[model samples]
Structures are given as structure tokens and as C-alpha cells.
Target chain A: MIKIAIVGFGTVGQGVAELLIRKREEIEKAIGEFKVTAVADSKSSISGDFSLVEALRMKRETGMLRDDAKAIEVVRSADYDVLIEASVTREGVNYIREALKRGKHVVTSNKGPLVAEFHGLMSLAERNGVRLMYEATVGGAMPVVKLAKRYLALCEIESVKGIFNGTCNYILSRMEEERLPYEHILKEAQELGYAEADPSYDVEGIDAALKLVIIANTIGVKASYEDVEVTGITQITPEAFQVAAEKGYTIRLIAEVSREKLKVSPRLVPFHHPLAIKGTMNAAMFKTDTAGSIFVAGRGAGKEETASAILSDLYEIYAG
Target chain B: MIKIAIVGFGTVGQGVAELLIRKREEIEKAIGEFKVTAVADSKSSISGDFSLVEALRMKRETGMLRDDAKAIEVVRSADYDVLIEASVTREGVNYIREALKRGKHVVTSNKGPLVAEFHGLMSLAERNGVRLMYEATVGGAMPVVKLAKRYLALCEIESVKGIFNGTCNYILSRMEEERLPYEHILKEAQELGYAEADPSYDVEGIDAALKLVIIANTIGVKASYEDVEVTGITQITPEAFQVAAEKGYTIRLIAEVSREKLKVSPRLVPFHHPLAIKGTMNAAMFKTDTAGSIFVAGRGAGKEETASAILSDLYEIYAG
Candidate 1:
């Protein structure tokens, strides 16, 4: 009977909740057993059979709901064993720190908090004897965290290079196929709901950089966001992509890890390489000791893919 | 103390014993509290003190000194916790079965015995609550077994494609690089200790088929040796190699598994694929659901490398 408190009740949070409800039995059989106990958002709060709007109204009517504060209250007082932090508005690091201090296990998909305070948060979890897992933060729907920690642990990793940002990959693929400019591609991606209102993070490689930090940490590599050199596809001209294609290469925004340096940049992967064939919205490529150069291509960003990763973490927590 | 017994003192057994002695402290530190209890070969036995020549002499004096029958006495009488089956002969299976029936955990790099009797052997080990690990049997030194059971279990493995036989890969790489004919390449490989005198098992893809069977079992794929489709490099000409290279492909004895089918044969892979880039004596590659594709390449067959795998299994047994 694992009880989880969902801290951010937004798109990812709703998606996770919807998945848990939809695939409860399957998820339990694969992992263990778990259930959502409560949900908290900036707009409202809900528990058990309560609705967010109704609960918020009741709390305000009873003078129990406070404004602009008490993010720590939900983490400390929520009747749950695990906290799923998915809200993007409030500072996720603050909520995560409070949850760790209160000895509550946490599962999150927020890369910003982890990128800024991974060391501090990990130490806190270690001291508290709880798990702080974030599998969905990077690669959207891909299992980058699990790869770095378990399968590749026994082997010496030569490199970890992949198209981490789905939006960027989608834009590049579109540009290559349609011959569109950066602005037009960006506008198309946003219109299609692939990019956010502000496309700076995905275009500038910040999102990919955060994922790199998470991967490096999981793989026992000593590095952070500052240590990684980032180059995004926003600066690349369509002519460059065409030239790379002519040279039997495909341009991709790849986050790579080799021996001496860590980098998140757009590189021309050879046409014969698996990563080179994976197009828009497909996450692929990882190098390990045993399975040689392998490739996995599928949806990288979407409600289903993101929800799957969240559900995977939920199942993992249940198993633990 | 964890005690280990070496049965069938062939090259792999001697290799394991020698590695244990050479890296005694390192192994001890890595594994914690382990020692070799006894060593048995067809010719003789090595006991009491740890001496290379004395060990060599012991191999002969214990009735295992000859290449004839009746040398199986050591296996029946030796008091040890774990038995390592290293003999290339069919009799090695007898010792393996005897050890398992006696409740002694067994580890081996012998593909012949396992390929012949995997179902019965696995069931026997399960009935006895003992582990029958054969990491070295398939890839010689590659960590394929560990990767399949531990890391990739969580992911849906769409397919497995790589060079499983070192002899075949070595011959093919040389032919491609030096533009040598099949007969000349085979002769060179035999002289360099890469291929056996007969070379039937490797050149016919039987060895790869055996390994593929083992991998299929580990990954929960139901298949037998006969069920797998195998094609060898026996008919591949130097012209074929040159022509493939001209078309940006390299010939490799590849074993591949998918949900629907399994193929153990030589195929032409493009230059950028990990299998094509894996030069002489190198083995690598694993693909999974979460990690996409991961690659690992290193020396595939060597005394130290294969022995190191045996030692790894020994440690796992101790920990369990």
C-alpha cells in the first residue's frame, strides 16, 4: 500500500495521475503496488474523493488555505509516503528539499531543481534513507536514468550521445525536410504544441544540458551543468544541414559524454550510425560494454511518452 | 571462505587459476574472502601450495595426467563449493551434472555442454537452488549474460545483432583488411591460435548458434539450436569482402534475435555500425527498451579476460 502525494497538478502531473488510474493493475504487477493519496497545485488542492476547485473553495471558506506560502505544508503534512513533484510554477527545489527533510521519498521529472541542487538533494536523501528518483526529467520518454545506473554500470562507457531535446529534433527534421527557417520551424513546433510559449530552453540546449547533468550524476561522473559545453541547432543554417546530408551525415543536437569532456551540441553523425536515421520526435542511441552500438527509436515527447516515464518511476518506487 | 574447484584443467581453467594467483590481492579486495580449494584436470590434480609448475605437475599426478578415460575421479572426490567446467571434451558435461546434482554451484565457459543440455541443467540448478552461470560461454569474455539478466530486463528488446564468435570475426576482419582468401585467412587464424584445428563450429556458425541459444534463454526468448537459422562465412570469398567494403559494409558472423525470429549467420553491416567498426578480437553491442542502443568493445578472447569473467561469477555466487 504505497501512498504517493502529487505536488504539481499540471499537465505532467495530470498525465501521470491519469496513467496511474488507467493502468493501475498493469503497473502494480510490473512494479509492485501503489496509489495516489493527494494532489496539490498552485490553483487548488485535492485529496481522496475531493475535487481541486471544490477543495480550494472549501479551504478558502474555512480560512485554511493560505496564499503565496505553505508549499512546505503539503510535503510535510500530506498523508503520503512518496511525493511526486511535477508542478512547474513554484520552486521545485524548495519543495524537494522540504520533502527530503521530512523523510518523504520523492519522484520528480523537474530537471531544473535537480540540475541546480542534485548534490545537496542526494545527500539529504542519503541522510534520510529515502530515494530521490527523477527518470522522466531527461529524454522526455526515454529511460536515460536507468541506462546510466544499471545496464551500463558493468561496462566501460565509451560515449553517451543522443538527440535529447524532442522539440529541437522535431524542428531540425522539419527544417531539413521542408527547408524552413529557424523562426518558421519554431513557430510550427509551437503551433503543434511541441514547443512551449518560450522556446529558448529547448533551442538554447538548456533542456539538453540539464539532462546531461542528470545522466552524468547517475553514471558516477563528477560534473554539472557548468562543466558541459552546449551548442544548439538554433545557430545552424539550413545549408549546413544540407551539406552534412551530402557528406553522408545527419545534424543532431546531441548530449555527449566521453572520457575527458562532457558536451551538449549539434554534431553531424554519420549516415550509417543509428542516431543518424532517427528523425523528428524520436529518442535513440546509447553505447555500452556488451550490446555494442545499439539504437532505440520511438516517440520522444508526448503525453503518452512522458506519462510512460512517470508511470515507470511510479512503478519503480512501488517496487522499492 | 568461499572455496572454488576447477574441473577439467584446460586453457580456461589454467587461465582462471593463474589469474586468481596473479591478481590475488586485487580479487580478494574486489570480492572479499575467497580462495581456490582445489584444481582437477584429466591428467592430475594441484593441491596444498600454490605453485605454477607444481600446479602443472598436480594436473598430471592425479590420474588427470593422461588424455584417456578414468580421469573423472577428481570431480567425484574433490571437496569444493563451486566447480568450474573448462574442459573442451564431452566428458566435461558429466562433471557439470555431477556437481549440480551434488548441490555444488557450477560455473563454466563451455558452450558444448550448455548448448546440449541447457533445459535439463537449468532446471536441475533451479531445483537445487543453486546458480549455473555461464557468462564466459557465449562471448568468451563479454558481459552479455549480465547485461541481459540485469540491465535490459526492464526494456523490451526488439532484436540482438552482433558478432558472437571471435574466430569468425578475426578471420573476417583480417580478410577485409589484408585482402586474403578464405583458405589463407583460415590458415593464418589457426597459426595465430584464433581458430581451432577443425574450425567447423566457428566457420559453420554452430558456435554462434550455441551462444544465441544461451542468450535467448536468458532474455526469456524460447528457442533451441535447431530453431535458430545459421549461415556461416565458409563460402565468403575475399572478393565478397572487398566488394562489401567498396559498398561501405563489412562482413561479420552476426547472431540476431527478435520476438519472431532468431538468425545466427554472417551478414554485411555498414561501416558506421558498431559491429563493422569492431576490429580484430573486439566484441561489443546491446540494445534495450529504455537505453535505446548501447555499445561496448574490447578484447573478446584472452586468458585474462575470460578468466576475469569466471572470477566475476565466483564473486556473485559468494554474494548470493
Candidate 2:
């Protein structure tokens, strides 16, 4: 049996708990016995009767004590094997560091801290002999993390090019289809829950740039954040999208990680390219020496999808 | 030390042996200790004292072992845990059945027997509680077998589309590139050692048809040879290829397995699609549920690649 301590009860956190509730049997069969021992959030988001909510009721009704510092203290001293950090990407690393310091294996969807302090965090995890898995940090539900591990061991990877930012991809796809201007599309994406409130991280290509750095680092390539060339769809006009479509090409915000040279730009991919046709989601096309080129495409972000990945990570812990 | 018995000394067999020797260290690191204990073939082909040629020295070496009966006798008596059956695909089920019955795991690059009797052979292995892996049975060195086993388990797979026959894919790609007629491409493919002497299996889509059935069965889909809707590359004209290319699409001999509908036909995939660009050799695309769609492309047939897959089966023995 695997015991888990979850920090942050936001969208992704609630989704993870819901997945555990609904797919308990399937999860056990696919992975192994796993149960979350505690959950705590900084916000007063907890409400309603505990039994009414699926897995949350296990915490809300029966009373696993909820307090931010107390949750941190328990995670630091408790007999849990796995820790989940699902807060804002920027601030989640402090809790992750605390968990890792206590020799707990961590699974996080946060990329901000990892991008800023990957080397240090990874070194710490290695020193402690605990795993720091962040599959959701990049492709959400995609198996980019596992693919990089397995394919890197087998083949010489030349590059990874793809739609790494679903928010931006969704915006571009919508703009093309609805004949909306950039701001209109942005507003629509924000309303549809595709874009963040600020949308700067995605529109400015910082989100994709971070994913590029993570991918390069994972593949053993030395690439600084500044080394990546970034160009988002902020400048892509509706006419430009229409022209590209007419020419049998699609404009996708592509993040490319290859050796030391990284490229993140909105490139025109022919309609036949798997990445180009992934349509309103994040997809990646991996180029390698032995396997030629492999394409991986999926929903970059969603409740059930992100939850599925979190569950997969939980299973990985059980396997270990 | 793990012992492996090689049951054929043909081109693919010798290729597997040579690969094992060349990639000895890397392979060993990935798996564990592996010693090729015995060689069985009608005639020796290599020159080393313990190699195929010397093993076939008849009196002094184990090379004297020939025929399915002799191979069965050696496998039954030997302490080896892995049996590699690389003889003529149509004629090696006797040895395969005997080894499986003995509870020894088997790895084969044989497609004929598998396409004909997959259910029976799989049931036999299941009854004996030993794995009968055929990773190389379809896309020689590509990860088709592993993909079906790994990602398909994770995703609610929507479909499996592939260019399963490298020979046919190569021929069609060459024809499209060179603007040559079918006969010209066939002659060139034969000269280039991509097509077999009698190319009916390849040109008529029978090879891909067989591969589709195997993949379908592995994925728990009730697919049979007769059930597949096959359209050979024999009818794919150069005009069609040129027109498709002009339209930003490339023609490929695609094998598809999904929802009781299996097919081996020519598809006009867009240029951006990974399959359109997986030229010359072998490639497969898996449209999975979680990771979306993943493509695997590599050497369709070669000794080293096939040997690598056989080694994968050997690993399962250790796992057991």
C-alpha cells in the first residue's frame, strides 16, 4: 500500500482526488494499492459536506486535519511515501523541497521552479535517492517523460518539435476557425478556460520556452533559458492564418529542443504533419536516429487528463 | 548467467548473433548477463570456431544440431531459458511449440506461423506460464510490440495505423520519389535488397495484412487475416502519388486496426503527418488515448534490430 500527502487543493488537486475516487479499482489493477492520507490548501476552498464529494469526502467528512503549516509539518515527519504538489508553478517548489528533504518521492505538475532551479533540485533528489517526476509539467497527459527516458536509452535524439502550449494552440486554432482577432481569440480562450487570466506566459512563448528547456535538460543537452528563441502567436494575424491554411500549411507555436541550439517559434507546418493537425491541443513530433520520427499528441491540459497523469505517477511509485 | 539458444543460422539469425557481439556491453547493461549457449541450423554460416560455421563442423561443435526435431531435443535438454526461433517462419512451429511446452520463453522474428496460428501459440505459452514475444515479427527493429504492450495499456486506444511492411513502404516510397512505374519500382526494390525474390506478400499487401492481424490480436481485438480489408500497392499509380504530393499529402501502404474494422490499404497522409515522412524503412503510428498519438519508426528488418527485440523477450524471462 502507498500513502500519499497532497498539498494544494486547487483545480488539479481536486481532479486528482476525483480520479482516485472514481477509478480506484482500475487504478489498483493498473498500478497498485494507493490512498491519500492527507490534503491541505492555503486557501479556504474547502466547504460543503465531506461525504457528498467523492474522494474529498474521505478528507472533509472523516476529518484528516487541514492546516497549511500542519500539512507541511506532517509531510515532513509523516510516514508517507509520496508527496503531490499542485499549487502555482512558481511557489510549489518550496513545499516540494520540504518533501524531498524528508526523503519523500515527489510528483509535480509545476514547471516554474523546475525551470529556474532544475539542476539544483535534480541534484538534491539524486542525493536523497528519491524520484522527482514531472510528466504533467510539459505535455499534461502525454507520456513525454517516459518516452524521453526510454527512447534516449535506445536512440540518438536529434530534436523535439511540437505544440507544447495548449493555451496558445487553442487560441490560434480558434482564431483561424472563428475569424477572430488576437484579443478576441484571447478573450474567448480565457472564457472557455483554455487561457490563464494573464495569458502572458502562453502568448509570449514563455510557457513553451520553459517546456523546451526542460526537454533539453532531460535529453542531456545544455541549454540556457535565454538560448531558446521565442516567438508566439501574438503577431499572427487572421489573414496570416487563412493564407497558411490556403497554402496547405498550419501555423503552430512550436517549441524545438535540439542539442545546444533551441528554437521556439510559430512555424508553418504542412497540413500532413501530425503536430500541425493535432487540432486545439498540445502534440509533439520527436525526431531520432533509430526510430526516425515519432509523433505524440494529446490534450495538454484538462481535469480528467491531468488527473490521469497524476494517477499514472502514483502507480509508478507503487511499482517502485 | 542467462543462456540463449539460436534455432536458425539464416541472414536474420547471423545478424542477431553479430549484433549481440557488437552491442554486447550496452545490451548487457540494459538487460543482464546473456550467453549464447547453442546454435541450431541446417548448415553453419559464420566462421568462428564456436560460431555458425564451426558449430556446423558436424562432429566437434553443437553445430550438428539441425531440423525441428534436433532443435527441440537440444532445447528440452539444455538449461537455456530463452529460445530464439529464426528459421523459415512457416516451418518452425514444431520447435516453438516444444520450447513453449517446456516452459521456456521464446522470441522469434517469425511472422508466417504467428499470422497463421497466433491464438493457438499464444494460448500454449499462457498455459505454460511463459512469454512468447515477437517484437520483430512486424516492424523489425521498431518498438511496435513494446508500444502495443506499454501505451495501449495506459490509453483507451482509438486506433492503430501503420506501414507494417517495410518492403512495401520502401517500394512505394521509391516509386513515388522516382516517378517510376510499379514494375520498375519492384525491379529496383529487388535490386536494392528491400523486396523478397517473390514479392507477392509485399506488393499485394499480404505482409502488412499479416502484421495487422498480429497487432490486433495482441491488443485484444478480434482481428483475423480474412477480416482485414487489404488494398495492395500494386494498384497505387505514379499519377496518384504525384497528385497527392502536390496536394501536400504522401501515399503510404497503411495497415489499420480499430473497432472490428481492420484494413491494409493505400492512404494519402498529409506531409506533416509523421507517417508521410517515415520514408524507405519501416514505421508505425499509435493513436493512443492518454498521450494522444505516438509514432514509432525504425529499421523494418535487420539482424541487430530483430536481435534487440529478441533480447526484449529474453528480459521477460528474467522478469518471470
Candidate 3:
């Protein structure tokens, strides 16, 4: 059986652990047998020869692992073939390096390492003979990077534009339809768990900008977060939506990345365009020379959705 | 370097040949080196040590290959690692079996062989230790089958609903905007080369039904054209769009496949829905037990678009 180490035992961490337990039989056939040998959160950790189902239960009931261990320690010394880095975006680079340097494959939803040190991490993985895959980083299970990198292998990609943030999309689409102030919708979204309590990362457009950086790099245009011109949905007013609707347009948080452009902001999308989607749905269009404009939309973020993307990465690495 | 044989000199056939000629340098890095060693059309054929550029022009200008050698003869003993089947949907099963039994991989945009003998061809390829990949058969380069089987690995797929036929989609969406009759729209589409001259394959929904059958089997539901309850867009009228638009809805030829059902017909989708897209764009939504609904849209049918999908399959097999 392949061994796994979960370095962040929160939402995505738990969701993927549970999926492994539930589909152990089927997943084995798809990508061979697997077992979660180590588990860790930001603070406490559990490692070596523990039941993943019980570890999921222990973390759910207690909100911490069984021991006061560090995530990096698990990354280095844990007896695992793959590292599941499902932690926050702010703390990923060094831990990821440790895993890769130790010759273990990695699959993550975390964007910190990818956004800040894209080429460095990639080269490290390449030199050390391991893979660093993170399809969940861009748009949950939407396959944004894999679409550009694998499926459209020969197409000369011109640019990519996407609605990457579900929180901003939910707030903006709600403001227009409900004719409510931004604060009211933001608060409603927070209450619904669509927005985090500390919501600047999403409302201020940093989240979508992070995703744009990954998409830009995957399509061979190297970009970091600093290269992006960011704008937020907090400035969009109900009156602005009223005027845009009269012109057959709706506002969406569009994250666009290309050779000459890197930006994320509230943009006007026509009613009939594929980007004009409702709810917290994520959508994107890749402008390519060969394939024309290809588009995809799906649940942008969730525990299960993010875990699904992570599982896809695992299958790509192991099964492939 | 891998040797490739083009087994049809039609649109998709020509497009793939052109892409290989143009992206020769980049594709070599992506999927090793490759060359077209053999090329064939329905009426005639050409073989090894010939240039693909001249063959493509020869087919377009003369409406035939350079000679009268049969297609099956090329399949039997062609010096190629892979066969690119882009011929008519009616004549493929035997040719594909010949290629596979010769210990060669086969990739195709053709559906006749897949629809009529799915298990038989698959087993033949498997037993010969090769592959039979046909992503373009369903949604051009949309990655419908790869998405279900690869990306969403652990999620149990329940159903797939899509706009598979670009001709039907073009007709229905144009009728709504231009307020034209069905016959007028069909005639316009035929003149635009979107619909075939006969139009029965697309306007009568047989094309979409064929795509649905492939999608169903790809997602693990056994289906054939006979199992589908098909209804074409030939009966739709301008007034039907008017009545539907009054209720904030539009009509699309939606093909849906599931374990318990198989059907293709014009269905009403809400204006804000992702399926209500206009023009010749193709879209699909897959319902999964874990990942929820994942949707994709794109240029469903084109020479380059179909070629793009075939290139993806090539990258998948040889690159892997």
C-alpha cells in the first residue's frame, strides 16, 4: 500500500481522508492501494501506523491531532510516499520543499508556495525526481491548470480569463439581483460560510489574483502575485449594476492572465457570455490559437470539491 | 520518434496533419518526436516516406488520395506506432481492429466502431497491449471522458448532459435571435457549412445521439443509439422561442445520459443557466456524487478543435 501524510487536518484534509476510507476498494483499482500513515494540523500531529478513519474522527471531535508535533517534522521523517498539503495559503513553501527534497510526491490546494516561488519549487521537484501537483490551487476541482497544460497541449494559448473567487462572485451577483448594499450581501455571505470572517483575502481580490498567477505560469507566462493588477468587488455598487444591466451586461470578478496582461477585478460580462454565471459558480475561458475559446464552470471551492481535485492529482501522479 | 498514420484525409484529418506540421518543434518536447509515415483517404491512399504537407493539399485540391490503395491495407501493415482514424463514422470497426491486432495504438474522432463494438474493440486493444482512445468522438476537445475517468477519479459520476452537436445548437440559437423559421435557419446553417448538405445527421439528432452513446459508455453506462430516445430540432419554430423567452427561458438541444436513462431533444433551459449559451458553442455538465456538478463549454466541432482533442490523446498515450 502507498503511504500518505496529511500535513493539514482541516476541511480538505478531512474530506480527502474520508474519501480514501470510503473508496479504498475502488481507488485501489484506479491508482493502487493507499493508506494515510500520518496526519497533522497547523499545531498538533499524528504519525505512523494510525487508522485514518479514527484520525479523521479524532480531528473532527477534538479539532487537533493526538500529539503536539510539527507539520514539517511529518513532512521530513514520516514514512509516506506522498504528502497532502491541504493547509492555508500562507504557510506552504518550506514544508513543500522538505517533502520534495525527501523524494516524495505532493498534491495540495495551498497556493503560498506556488504563488510566491513558482519556478523554484518546480525546479526543485524536477531535480529531486518528484512531482509537485496542485490542481486545487486555482479553482477547486475545475481542472484549470490541467486543461492548459495537458488537454490543450499543442494549442498556442493567447490568454485566460476566469471567475475564480466564489465569495466575490456570490457577493456581486447577489448585490445586483437583490438590489442590496454590498455590506448586507457580504454579511449574508459570511453567515452562509461562503465568505471568511476575515474576508479581505477574497473581497479585496487577492484570492482571485493568486489563482491568476498559477494559470499564467501554467500557460508558460511566468507571473507572481506582485505582477498582477488587483481590484476588488467591494467598490461595486447596486446602482452600477443597474446601469450595466440596461446595457445587457452583468458584473463578475474576472481574473485574466496573458503574456501582456495580469489583472483581477470586477468586469462587465455580456448576458449571453459563458462567464456570466450565477451563484458561487466558477467559470473560465481560455483564448487559444488552435482550439478557439474553450470554457469551463464548476464549484470553485469546497472541502469535497477541493479534495476531489487533490484526488485527481494523486491519480495523475500514481496512475499515470 | 513515433510513427503516425493518418487514416482519413477529411477535415479533422487535414487539421491534425497541419497541427503536427506547424507545432513540430513544441510537440516533440511534449510527446517525444513524431512523423506521419502513412496517410489514407476513403477513396485512395499514400504510404511511407511521403510528406504530409503535400498529401493534405493533394486531398483538398483533387478530392482524392494520390493512388487507389485501400484504407484497410494501410491499417494491416502500416509502419506506424499509432493510427489516427478520422474517416467516416460508418467504416471503422474492422480497420481499427486490424490496427490494434497489429500491436499498434489507435486514436480516432470516429464513432461507428465505438458505438457498435465498444467492448470488443477495447478488449482487442487491451489484449494486444495497446490503446484505443477517442476523446474527440463526444465533444471535440472538451475532455468529457478524461474529466470523468481521470480528473474526478474518486467521485461517482451519476449523469452527463451536454450540447454535443454544434449544427443543432447553431440552428436553435439563431432561430431565437433572428426570429427565422426552422427551414430558413437550417438552410442558412447548411450554407455556412455548419450543417451538412443532407442535414439528417444533425437536424434529426442522430449525431447528438451518437455522442451521447459514447459518453454514456465512457462514464460506465452501457448505451447505444437504439437505446436513446431521440428527438431532433427540425420541428422547433420561431414562435416556440418567443413563447419560451417570455418566461425567461431558451431552448437547447440537450443530450443527457445516465444509468437509468438515455435521451436527446430540445429542452428549455433558464436564461441564466450555463446551458443557455448562444451560437455553435458546445457545453456539458456532469453530476457526481462527491464533486457536485462540473460543467464545460467550447467549440464542439472544428477541424482544429477536433485536431486539438486528438493531439491531447496523443500526448496522453505517448507522453505517459
Cα lDDT listed for each candidate: 0.70, 0.72, 0.87
TM-scores of chain A across the candidates, in order, are 0.87, 0.88, 0.97
In every candidate, how many clashes are there? 23, 9, 0
Predicted candidate 3 versus true structure: per-residue lDDT over A238-298, tens digit per residue: 9999999999999999999876679998889998788888888888899999888888888
Among all windows of 10 consecutive residues in model 3 chain A, the one with the lowest summed lDDT is: A87-96
Task: Output the better candidate (1/2) by DockQ.
Answer: 2
In what order do the candidates fall by lDDT, top score first? 3, 2, 1
| Residues A131-209 of candidate 1: C-alpha lDDT, one tens digit per residue | 8888778766655675554434333456677777778888877887887688888899999888888888889988888
Ranking by TM-score: 3, 2, 1
lDDT of 2 by residue, B1-320 (tens): 77788877666676667667766686677677777777766543222125433343442345344334455556666667788888854348877888999998889988777878888998999899888889878877566776676534545667888888778888777877798899988998899887778989888998889888899887778666889898998888889988898888888888888775699998898766667755556766666555455566656776556665665555544531
Better model by lDDT: candidate 1 vs candidate 2: 2
The most accurate candidate by lDDT is 3
lDDT of 1 at B240: 93
The sequence of per-residue lDDT tens digits that candidate 1 reaches over residues B158-272 is 6676677778888888888788789999999899887878999779988788888888877777778889998999898888988898888888888888776688877888876
Candidate 1 chain A minimal-lDDT segment of 10 residues: A63-72
Positional deviation of residue A198's Cα in model 1 after best superposition, in angstroms: 3.0
